[PDB]
Design a protein around this ligand. Sequence first.
Ligand code: TYE
Ligand code: TYE
Lengths: 320, 321
Amino acid sequence: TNNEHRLTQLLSIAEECETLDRLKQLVDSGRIFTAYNGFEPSGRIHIAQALITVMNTNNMIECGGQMIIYIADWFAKMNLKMNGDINKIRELGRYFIEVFKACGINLDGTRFIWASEFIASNPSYIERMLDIAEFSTISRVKIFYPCMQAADVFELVPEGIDICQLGIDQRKVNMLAIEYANDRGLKIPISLSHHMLMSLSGPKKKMSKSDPQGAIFMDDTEQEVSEKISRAYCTDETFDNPIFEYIKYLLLRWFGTLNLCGKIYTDIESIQEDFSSMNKRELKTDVANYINTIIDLVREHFKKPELSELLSNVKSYQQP
Amino acid sequence: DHTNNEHRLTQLLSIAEECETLDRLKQLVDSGRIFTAYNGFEPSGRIHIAQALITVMNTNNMIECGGQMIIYIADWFAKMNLKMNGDINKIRELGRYFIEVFKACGINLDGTRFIWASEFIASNPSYIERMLDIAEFSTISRVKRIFYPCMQAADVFELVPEGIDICQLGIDQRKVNMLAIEYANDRGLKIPISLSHHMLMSLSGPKKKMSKSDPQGAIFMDDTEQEVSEKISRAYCTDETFDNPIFEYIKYLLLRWFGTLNLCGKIYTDIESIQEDFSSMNKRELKTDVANYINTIIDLVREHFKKPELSELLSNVKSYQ
Ligand SMILES: N[C@H](CO)Cc1ccc(O)cc1
Ligand SMILES: N[C@H](CO)Cc1ccc(O)cc1
């Protein structure tokens, strides 16, 4: 039954999973397994990315796994982020790492790998890219970005990563990796994808466009968080409601217990039932207070004198 | 006048056995603009005297003709190919060894620039993208009817921003340059020019192949004076110039390197006279002179590695044996 719990846990983080079957076998085998997540450093880190990465990582470990955090600095450069400056990209990568630390990521079962350094040390990684690109091309016969990332799950570790833990918006990549693995008789990577937090501006709004307002960043001050929550789209229904989304995907999971509008909640079911009748101004006040408590971990972490250099550089890049 | 450009064109062509179109090379030379050339190699435990001298001679000629040489140290590829069992530290150490040998033999550093693959790949994402794009071209070409070639082919396009003008490699690597040329035509890019040099035959025979199987088939920059004498003494040698490795060493290495050769009691300054007198030369006495001239060249390296600053490199390379 212990393997049943471990299984329900790992599945609690995902909105989608490539065959629960394959995941069930891995959990049942009872053997140490590996999972990974990657990101391209950028000017600022969304609260969603920071918290979800930390919760998922800490969960993998507790469930008997090892986590690999892939810092795709090389790819960020290739995608011209930070106008291609690798030194700025790397500082940003370190900033992200420090944010994960401040938030409690479990370093005992977590390893950080940098793309630029990994690529220079493992030619097979690039070879894997070529082979996947060949598979893809020949397939469509009857863009490389996908093939390049698809190689990650097979090369980050000798036997190949067991679980690819990414956002649901990365679906196409892990699907290719699975197609490829089957056509090459390799171990099939297990996909564990999480929900993509919606914009605070509402369903009619996009994302990353006018993003400053549409999302909370780990560098936002207390006043900025409160103002972004005040402006956020919010109706009396839970569907397409960013306030309900932040509560469900971030706050309840992070804190376990929430005191909302004078009532204590320990499960999303009860919050959903009372949602329509909650005074929304009071709810927003509580939501912003809980969010600010989380970000305070980062604010306090970066007060350490040893991180002043990092902090100053990050701010200058028109970032935190 | 145009005469200077004629000499420049003629000098550049003298280093090659094959040239992908004289037309493209003439235009480049006539343009009068500074141009770039590159040569690449994977570090190895030992370095053939052929590679050492030819790299130095070709490099110095390129520069003398108004060009800039890029020497690409393929350490990354050496590891991928498992040289030294994949140990990157030994590979780079050997890479430094090769460089000190080029320097000992007088390569012109003022017009030469070294670039290591491991570092280049980590700093230039476009390089890898080029490999992928070339691989797609090559795959679609077949489907319209092994990635190692597509990988090396990217070199001429990425080593420098505007792409390298001249690919200067041994003729045994013509397939890679030809791929690059086809690729370049399809994608409308500057067409790379190849200037491929002759591959020296094995001292063991015209049919024998180069391999760690018989280290006697070639002279290495680490061979001792007694060792070269023995290797030359035992080398295959008939009275004809064809299928003769002794003749090849004289033609492609000695005459070009020294300009004047005293062989079997006679002075030679051109290959035709050597060829006409070859059959009647006492071969045992010829081998003596050939071995002596070769040892004079290697003495440059032996002396170079006596410097105290290189005692470290020396010891390391020696241990890798
Ligand atoms: N490409 C993603 C965001 O742009 C980040 C990423 C995700 C997974 C990887 O294996 C690598 C990078
Ligand atoms: N592949 C060659 C010998 O095996 C070495 C080489 C030649 C040219 C390059 O651009 C790279 C490596």
